[PDB]
Design a protein around this nucleic acid. Sequence first.
DNA 1: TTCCGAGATCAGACGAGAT
DNA 2: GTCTGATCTCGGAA
Lengths: 58, 64, 463, 1044, 44, 76, 58, 138, 50
Amino acid sequence: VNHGMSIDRRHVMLLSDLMTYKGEVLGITRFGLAKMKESVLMLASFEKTADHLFDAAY
Amino acid sequence: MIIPVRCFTCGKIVGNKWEAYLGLLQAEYTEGDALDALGLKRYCCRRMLLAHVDLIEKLLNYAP
Amino acid sequence: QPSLHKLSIMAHLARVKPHRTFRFNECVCTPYNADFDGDEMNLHLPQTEEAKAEALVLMGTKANLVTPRNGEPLIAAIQDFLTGAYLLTLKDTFFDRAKACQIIASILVGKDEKIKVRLPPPTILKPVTLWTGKQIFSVILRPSDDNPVRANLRTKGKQYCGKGEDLCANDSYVTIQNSELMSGSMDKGTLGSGSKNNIFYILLRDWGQNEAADAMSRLARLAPVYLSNRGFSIGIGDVTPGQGLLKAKYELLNAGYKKCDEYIEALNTGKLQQQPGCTAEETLEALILKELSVIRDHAGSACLRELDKSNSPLTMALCGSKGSFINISQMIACVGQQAISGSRVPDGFENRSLPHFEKHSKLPAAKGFVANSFYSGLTPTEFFFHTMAGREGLVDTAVKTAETGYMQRRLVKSLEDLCSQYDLTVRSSTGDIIQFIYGGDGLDPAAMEGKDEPLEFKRVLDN
Amino acid sequence: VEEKWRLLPAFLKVKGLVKQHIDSFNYFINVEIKKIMKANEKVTSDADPMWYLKYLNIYVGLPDVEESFNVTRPVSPHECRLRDMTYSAPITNALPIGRMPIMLRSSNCVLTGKTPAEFAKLNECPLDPGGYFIVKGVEKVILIQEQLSKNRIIVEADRKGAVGASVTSSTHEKKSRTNMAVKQGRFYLRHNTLSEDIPIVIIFKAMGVESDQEIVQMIGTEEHVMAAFGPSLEECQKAQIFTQMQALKYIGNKVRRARELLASTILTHVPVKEFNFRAKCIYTAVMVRRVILADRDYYGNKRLELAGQLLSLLFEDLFKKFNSEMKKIADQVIPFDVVKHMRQDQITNGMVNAISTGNWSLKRFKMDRQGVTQVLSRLSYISALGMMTRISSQPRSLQPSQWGMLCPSDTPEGEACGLVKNLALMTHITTDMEDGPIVKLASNLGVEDVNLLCGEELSYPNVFLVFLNGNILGVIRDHKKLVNTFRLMRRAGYINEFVSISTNLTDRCVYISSDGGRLCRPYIIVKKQKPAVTNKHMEELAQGYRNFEDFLHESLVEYLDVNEENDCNIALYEHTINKDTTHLEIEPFTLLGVCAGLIPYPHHNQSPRNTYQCAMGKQAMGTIGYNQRNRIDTLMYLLAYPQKPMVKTKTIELIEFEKLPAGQNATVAVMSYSGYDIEDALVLNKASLDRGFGRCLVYKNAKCTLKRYTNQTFDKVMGPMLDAATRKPIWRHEILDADGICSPGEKVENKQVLVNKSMPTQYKDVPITYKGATDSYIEKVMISSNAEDAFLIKMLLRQTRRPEIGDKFSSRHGQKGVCGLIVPQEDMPFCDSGICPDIIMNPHGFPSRMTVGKLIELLAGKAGVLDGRFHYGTAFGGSKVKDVCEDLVRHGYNYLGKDYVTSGITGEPLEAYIYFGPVYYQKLKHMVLDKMHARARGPRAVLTRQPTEGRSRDGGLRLGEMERDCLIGYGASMLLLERLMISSDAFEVDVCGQCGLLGYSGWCHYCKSSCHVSSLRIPYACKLLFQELQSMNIIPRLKLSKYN
Amino acid sequence: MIYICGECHTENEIKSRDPIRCRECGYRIMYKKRTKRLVVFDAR
Amino acid sequence: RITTPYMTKYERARVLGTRALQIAMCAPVMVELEGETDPLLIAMKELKARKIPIIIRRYLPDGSYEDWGVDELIIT
Amino acid sequence: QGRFRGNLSGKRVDFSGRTVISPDPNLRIDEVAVPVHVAKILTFPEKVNKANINFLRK
Amino acid sequence: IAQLRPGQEIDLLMHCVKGIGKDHAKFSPVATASYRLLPDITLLEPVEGEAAEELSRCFSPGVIEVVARVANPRLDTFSREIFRNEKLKKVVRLARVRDHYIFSVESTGVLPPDVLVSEAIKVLMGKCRRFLDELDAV
Amino acid sequence: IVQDEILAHRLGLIPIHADPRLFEYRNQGDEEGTEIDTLQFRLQVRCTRN
DNA sequence: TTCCGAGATCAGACGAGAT
DNA sequence: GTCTGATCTCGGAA
Ligand SMILES: [Mg+2]
Ligand SMILES: [Zn+2]
Ligand SMILES: [Zn+2]
Ligand SMILES: [Zn+2]
């Protein structure tokens, strides 16, 4: 609201509630995706495609 | 290139008024009243002679 | 191709026309963020019959009239249609049955050619009989006799009169009863995109979405036919200051400069009091900005008082079609202090912004103030500082989209696999619950009314 | 006081635009090839020390070409443009070494000095900038790079006050960066050869000054903060008992990956030492002095490397590769021109391959500058001249130090919003010079160094220390006498005009810069409040009885760079002269470039609307040169009837833009019409387009060459295959003409054959066909040999396009617009005198963009045509509105230009008046025939079996992953399967149930048992993922399931 | 096969596998003569 | 019996999705159509007449289901 | 450029075109005017189903 | 038509056809065929005493007489200079008669302009008799 | 040196003194003309030095 | 006595699309 | 050419 840019709270009530539902606040970075998702190709389609595919073969 | 033979807006025949215009500017005639001598009343047919450049005498040099 | 929200892909029915351009209605151009300045946009053609229905129902323009951030309508009038329908619903216009049946009968092609179009009875009878402008705008909302639309709307407008509900002579207060415009003129805020009380949003919620798309495709056909025969046009007479501005701007530039000469002199020659923020030479500039923004807004108010009605940039600013009252003060009266990232322009040389001024000059017109408006033309130092402040607009759009493109990517690569399941819970792909009801009430933000409430009960009861 | 603008057309005849490219190359030919021989004489070998090869001189002759043994004929530059050669001259007892390409209008090119009558027989346009080499047929410019200065003490803010001098070795072999860091309050001297951030007092004791009393006396005698140098380091030096000079070389002698007396010469290089290190110590001490007393983007720091400075970086390296291979030969055959003539390949194919592929790949200087050259954009005239004055970077925001040197509004937008600049009009990049008389006047005027006590150069006010080019040259007690005496001397002419003395009083360093590469500019000297021009001088220049260079020696015009502009009080006009004016300003419209400056009234628009035009001015579609018909270039756009603009500026006459214009000027009438002009769109009429308003001429170019192979067979151009009659194929060989090459003056449909190039494998014909979409007429067909004589043949395809719906017009103010509708003429609002408009412009482009400069062109144009006059709207001046408006009244028009029209459709008069007049609308090169595209089902790429990328390869446009989320957010599931598997990669694969892996066709090779194998349906790109995952050791073992 | 010189403009009947030099010149830019067929144009 | 008795926009899309593709493979038409050749335009005539031989299988995410006839739903 | 971010998610697509846009207010909000030359190239496989038999024959 | 240099040819046959002007503008029989309503200018107040010659130079030259009389209104181009005067703008209303216009046909020279107009009326009559015979069929 | 279409377009804009309503429209494509529909002109200019 | 905090060095990434 | 969490080495203490 500081930048104009009105938005529903129900969008932010979802983004916050995703971001903090597994114990701790999991920021949406490359690193927070590993602690949010279990499936590999969803992580592998995101950043670090090399390590996420080898580590899930290990 | 060469003089467009029409006005773009109205379409007065203006292609036959180039060497008659250049013959006027060879004399004393000022740029303004030269086009009043050729019967160019409105300005849209006046810019077809005034704003025109004649590249065709210059390209011909480089076209043996 | 820079798809930034859900509305950048939209389905469309396809009519084979005679040209090589993709031509669409200009109401749907702000969802695409598409101007016609040489922009290109792609056209996919779904092959299976299942993917044809998923385009038509889910992604049709008649379905996605409303952005899912706010609930505001994005498909609504832009530019000329707004300044067409404002000039038509303005209080002064009167049409005789010559022009009235001509403007009205523009709305009779393409699913509209089979209606007995009912001209309303005229609002002047005896001395001459003639219609009013707003009575012809009611034909947009209800052209036939057997049309079931009864639109209702009561709202404020731009240049609102402040006092008086609907009876003051400024006439910026819309009241539609049963799809008949009873008072007021159609601003941007009653026709354009971004307001939750324009008619195309009101026709959407109360009367289905086919009547909102029809009444929007009626206005796009009607309002240019009025405007091209009324001739709205801008000129340099619409930018020249009158006599009253010049004697107002001359004193404001003098009395605004006497004090800033003293406020500079009260700092260095002697003792200057300090604002609580910082020391001297920091609150001096914040007290410079107060007196210079006094100048550009009093001269901006000196301009707007003398600026005669039916002025073309004024008319484009009253209805919010293009450009606010800031741009008229910049063009005519005086464009204010050119600010670089929230301050006066920084000294690129030693203690001096440009080598024309003196060293350590904190003077106005030496650190970024431009005194001439765009009519009287900027001077070389003034043109440079306006360029310096102008490039910070251009530079920041290059770097923001370099970041918010990434921030769009990280956001959607985590948040994509959520959907509100059938028992109202919102779960992840792995079954784990994020929310127990979506957002506490289980309500669409898209269908949500203003104030984050699905109804706004004052409007429904009066409807 | 009245007329001083005349200095600018006299400056442009000498060294102003595209003459800084030329002089820089003319310096490189006539000086720099004779300063590389002095560096690289005496080719000696060790296997025989009794011979010697010694170069005397290099001459670089006139451009020639041989086609046989000894014809050695000369060449015009517009023959190398046709025969795809490279315009070059030989490099030279008195025997050739190689060949080096020559930029046009250089001192050894053909085109200099010759009249326009002689430009015809050389087939070259006289209004053509020059400054571009012709390499392998295409014409390349070396773009001006901007680098930071050399040996500059820059005080940055990495963590706290780190300073690093990026010294560049005058012996150019290396460039080192001896930065100085602060860690936990202690100074260090980090380098890239040092394995450790060593404390600075370790260096100082290694540098010969052993005692600690001397070091503080160097840094700060006045203690107040330089006492806090004390317990930082000289205690930290003393905390380990290490007071010794030889022992403190020893700590350097370990970490440097007695032996360091030499290796301290590769640290802070350009401070010179003859093993008298006293000069080196003060320069390190001044580097520490800055930190304790403590702008990377400021144009006194940015030096510009031109095309001739940049080729000398190459040719010195290519001479060395030619030089060292003479040693490799003389050490091969001794246990000499005849083993050298095959190294004519070395320079010639070294120099040319560096310009065509824009790569200085120089391992000898460790630099890999990519994209230094660019092919010239011959779209219009000014798109050629806008490339000659172009600066590429290596920040984005506009600094005010670019005032007068660079154009503020000429920039691209996108990746390079402030990184690709453009030179202004009245600028001049400097060249190098000798430093002899600079030092010789410095040591007379008063300076002293290496005998002064460490303490002197300190907080005491009278210690301004002179710095030349980054090397300290003594200290002067009185800065004013030195700055003033050098300045009087330079004006008198004893010192070179370009050298600049500037003074920074924050740190007492005066700065004599003779660098070469500094952005410079001239100003009119203001001694007392009366200027120096005196008008009568502006009259001498009128008859020519004097030249701009006579102003310099008469001390009337001074060249000022950016650094000297810190010390001046530049007055903009005559009437703003003050008590302390110093220099004045020649003509203030020269701060705009050559792409802006084209704009009339740029000082009335919002400034981000001039910048839009500087992109679109280069994109304009107009005439190119007087030789535009003999050029065969890959894409040449020509206007049918160009017109010079009605509202010219003053920069248009100096460029002679009106001699070869771009765009007509149509009578617009800004009004809202028919609602097909909403988002910047604009309505044209279908009579002006029938009368020839902006007919296009798009000229493509197709070519082929017929090479003789190593097999000694060759290519044939056998004629048409007449079938059942003399008539050629169904349409395929219809235009061939029986000599092979198609006939000039004939139309080519799609898939019609231009030449029958047939190739030996025995002959498989490779027919060069014209694809297009629409038809094209052959205009010329040229036949020649290239350098390796192989019969090249070049076509030239006319195509005229009347501008229909889609074709982008701009408006000379950045208000571009696709032509949305083309109405007939009789449906259009004629005024009283009969003039129906050409281009109805929407009036909503004005109040948000605030381009008031457009609204005056409809006034200055309309008064202009009615009087028979071209109204100057320049920048910061030109014809004012209060005199234009009283010229409409004499011809019976409205004094604002708003003319009473009556509507064309309804016949009644319009309710409001309509603004009306001629403004210069330039068509630009975005026509929808080049961009209409659809792909039903065509070629797929060979690797991933997706549709290809490009319209030239029948397209398919990427439904990107951002548009994937849009299709996700709609919830359309069956669309995405259809849009990303069905109609992109519809593949079919076979896997097996057990051991689940890709097995081909009916059975899987692993576990041959053939029973479990069950086909899947998958995208091919996912199958290619599995099969390249399984190639490395990751094995996606699919476990299928039946559809439930 | 008849070709026209670079600037000499003399019709030079060359044949195949022949250098493209010219009678009365040495210049190797040889354009081709215009076609002989009736080419129909539209005045639109 | 516990989910929403309103036909969602994702159920109207797929019911029109597959009833279009069924009727484009010569399915028996239920609406005695009046010259519509687009199979999708037939399917919206099927929906408004409420004659579509389709039952929506609504999956509660635990695994249990709940059927819903397209006759038995409230379209918009 | 790799197969994940550009060949598996953002993959090129058949039956798809691209031109320059120009306005047309005389259409309903739901309709795009498609050029003839594009509409003769982009094709829809319409199966023959007793109601478009005479239409597809025509 | 074009310019040449020696050794250059132009050889071409032409075909002329009868074309409507709306097909292409090269078929247009008239340079400009505009019209304008005849103005009539009424001085509401009598003007005299050097304000008359002020009002003389304000209008078009031939339009006025000098007291002030509006001698011949047909020659008035609508500069609208009165509103710059700030004194006479309240004095005189300027107006144009609605049912009295002034045509101005200037032919290119194909047909003489008195036969262009009598052909122009003749094809409007033919355009409505083309439709009146459509109703006679139906 | 004048391009072919631009010549052929500039031959289009030249008015022709033969009055219409002696002739009729061109019915079919009919590029041969029928001397009741068309009116042919010839232009043969070849310049030399005097 | 060991262990956990705080000093260095190391990663993969840094928007669409278009000619 | 930085912005980044991770993961390694040092060090002072109950
Ligand atoms: Mg755009
Ligand atoms: Zn005209
Ligand atoms: Zn197997
Ligand atoms: Zn010859």
